[model samples]
Target: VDLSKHPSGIVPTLQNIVSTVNLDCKLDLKAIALQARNAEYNPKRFAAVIMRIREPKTTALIFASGKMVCTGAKSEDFSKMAARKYARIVQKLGFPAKFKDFKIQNIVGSCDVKFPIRLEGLAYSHAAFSSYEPELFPGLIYRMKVPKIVLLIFVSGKIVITGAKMRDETYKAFENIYPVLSEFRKI
Candidate 1:
């Protein structure tokens, strides 16, 4: 889950506001991506994606203290459930969100995850997260961005590996799922 905008770009300015209201931590402000693949066929492994939360920027900050959104989920219910993992990760990292009051942006409650999450994936240059909203995520969404976020989880997964970014930045405002790249190699 690549974090382009923070809670629809409201994170930076409102980070303190939101945090003060909820006593939440600072924002991580980084975009992240993870993938699971297979050389063979696996039905249960059909595009399971665990999305990420929002951050203020792509540089300087490494895992800001704050809230998270578990989105881009194929199955909405499963998405929401998976999002909880995001929340848990945040809490585990000493950051939390105004969960009860915070927004979920695009909520796709238990349905087919719109974007092409399979192998050889679709043109990830189109609108990805815009399609799923309210019904699944339960938050306010900002406009969509380019550099499409494609779901390619081999085991159909999310990357909270140890939870929280504790490394450097990348070219795009994207997070690279560690170790999984080799696991992807295994696939």
Candidate 2:
């Protein structure tokens, strides 16, 4: 369970973090879309205002109810920072927007094992937790129970871990799967 004791020396790199925040006040999407430089809203297409910021390289979906969803952040801290920035942007637009209930919804991480994997054997052996249909999808989908994470394992040794609420969960899921992946490594 402890990755520190493992010798694989492989660590997952966080790719994206999706977070949400409540502005604690009603918002005018039309006003925001008109005032913000990188905001667009078309009620005919989507109800929320889609806004983008360059510093954190994140996108925000601002709803009329003051709920905001922030995405494309690489880390949890960055996700919170980006959410706060979006709240500030809303506040500056003349609404009493308060940053409240900020929470991380999902975290995605990826890593490479540096060797090909025998996915067919893995899928056959670990049928309870894995699904692999080469005709439908190339990667093997592994559902880990402990951390409640879904891993997309490719034959090229690349693995993507998703549906994690914390970074440690991603690491733990990888640690738990490393041994299994090693067992299926193609020589």
Candidate 3:
């Protein structure tokens, strides 16, 4: 992913935000390459920035564009602390200003992310979270809701899906959580 276009990739902007977010919480920011890691590719079309925070870490699912972002994360899903720190940056950018704290329902469309009016949410895990929309085929609606798992966002904008007792559990949570992220993304 192009760090130049990303909010936290560039110096000053990303560094500034990361500093503030980390002040609010204790989390590290790290980046991981998808190609070198995940054997598969499923990035929900839009690139992801995951955060792996501490326990009780709050996360909000806000959708923008064809891609969805989960913020307010106490602990990010992918891995490491970077994912959690990244989530806080976007949440701080949430529209309406009132949505300062982005959550499962506060997501709204903004000039930042350009998403279609209607799109489906599907949970992509370490096993399948590497592929882009083109690789997922068609007729997909909402990510298979994700209840609880471990995920981390890298500066590269790719998410590392992990921390699931079983694959089926990840699917179960995603089935419900996907829409929540999508609805919040809508303006």
Candidate 4:
């Protein structure tokens, strides 16, 4: 079986990118959390301040130790931009916040094969990297080591790929698994 040929060539759509950055300045979480309209703080529940912005539709976790983690951005650039906006918000709140060590932590993408898959057969064949427990979860979890992405594959041929640090890795992971998924296609 020449695995290079993809039966149904489809590209994955990027869902979200979670990135982190260091503000490099200690912050008074209570002040900004209470002052900012887009910020929320519940020290009893969580230590970080939960802030949100509309342009990128992203949420940020601002820590007192000058660290910020941003999630829900569709692309890496948006993630970085959102992080900057968040830091600027902090700086405006009277903290000397500096943008530093910005990094993409994870990228999530999803795709569909347009056909059903025999989950049992796939799980049996790729036991080393696949985990399927229909009773617990309807999808099969396939772990790819090369790009280190985790794919949640359903019998309906839908797949969610995550754990990619870059967007290209998400595309590569889908490409690498497409042939295998085709082989398990239900007739």
Candidate 5:
């Protein structure tokens, strides 16, 4: 919402946010998998009941221990909304589900600089914070210290920011790296 902080006009858009909520009661995964729609559970393959909702386009992993992990949300608010929806689904299935300790675990954001970058030069200059093994990964991994976010920067100027607990951290990390990226812009 605030464009003042992003002078480059390249504010990163949140692609996904992963959040977790405790149901505060033990759950029977098998029953949930059987009773709920868009739900599946295979104890031999995975321990949690996998459920999906189309409205938010999110998936939730419901564990027997009453912990749930919701992912595939494009915003923090949506992440919480989707988590609550999953909890309600479990509650309707007869579990005394109480939403508790809901918190964001990770946020992923991406943006493009609309220019080319010299990965080799940037990696060499920022060796302590960068790792670019082109043979293994096309994108250079840049771990920022201030915002404590990790960025995947490609030569095509597309960047992905992850490990952000808040949306602002993603913007901050991108702003911090934009100047450095400019210095390494391919000629």
Candidate 6:
């Protein structure tokens, strides 16, 4: 289903945020996977302990090196909160875990332009930062600098914005690109 237009000034919704943290100690993956109800580990398949929490509704990749990566949060704060929740889970499991160096790695957002776009024209005009191959992919890939966000724009005007560390960055990036997208808008 196509999403309605964002009323000229609105940007995409922050769909997901991926963040990482250092637990500051080694972890026992097997123990956590077995002890925690929402944890799972398969050393042969994956090296990290996969954990989940319902509050922020995120999944964490907990490693023995005390490094954690949390995904599926809508905001950076939620990602940090989920990471803390995972650290606490480790603490409850009798591990001397310390949450430290928590940082957001990536933020993904999506929006609708509410109209069709001329992908070929936009890609050619912004060739330095765009790559469009319709046979391989259905959307035009736009790489933005300064804010460092990547946008996947389709002919249907659906766009997926990503590679943002903060929500404001995502917003700013979308705002900066809207006018450009309008230039290539298909009637």
Candidate 4 has what TM-score?
A: 0.94
**Per-model CA lDDT versus the true structure:** 0.28, 0.91, 0.30, 0.90, 0.93, 0.87
Off by over 4 Å in 1: 1-23, 28-67, 96-98, 102-104, 107-187
The lDDT, on a scale of 0 to 1, for candidate 6 is: 0.87
Per-residue alpha-carbon lDDT of candidate 6 for residues 95-121, written as tens digits (9 for 90 to 100): 989988989899999988798999999
Highest lDDT among the candidates is held by which one? 5
lDDT of 1 at 141: 26
**How close is every model to the real structure, measured as TM-score?**
0.25, 0.95, 0.20, 0.94, 0.97, 0.92
| Candidate 4: Cα lDDT at 21 | 93
Write the number of the candidate with greater lDDT, choosing between 1 and 6.
6
The order by descending lDDT is 5, 2, 4, 6, 3, 1
Q: lDDT score, residue 27, model 4?
A: 88
Best by TM-score: 5
Tell me which residue pairs clash in candidate 5. Answer: none
User: Candidate 5: worst 10 consecutive residues by lDDT?
Assistant: 1-10
After superposition of all CA atoms, the RMSD between model 5 and the true structure is: 1.1
Stretches of model 4 off by over 4 angstroms after superposition: 1-8
lDDT tens readout by residue for model 5, 1-187: 4668897788798999899999999988888878777898999999989999996889999999999999999998999999989999888899999999999999999999999999999999999999999999999999999989999999999999999998889999999999999999998
When 2 and 4 are scored with lDDT, the better candidate is 2
Error of 6 at 123 (Å): 1.0
**Model 3 spans > 4 angstroms off:** 1-147, 151-160
Compose the digit string of candidate 1's lDDT tens values, residues 30-66.
2222121211222254322233334321111122334
Candidate 3 residue-wise lDDT, 66-185, digit = tens: 122333422223222333444444335442212223222221111112233222222343224322243544322222224444333222222233334433343333333333334534
Question: By summed lDDT, which 10 consecutive residues of candidate 4 come out lowest?
Answer: 1-10
How many pairs of residues in model 2 come into backbone collision? Answer: 0
Instruction: Point out the higher-scoring one by TM-score: 3 or 5.
Output: 5
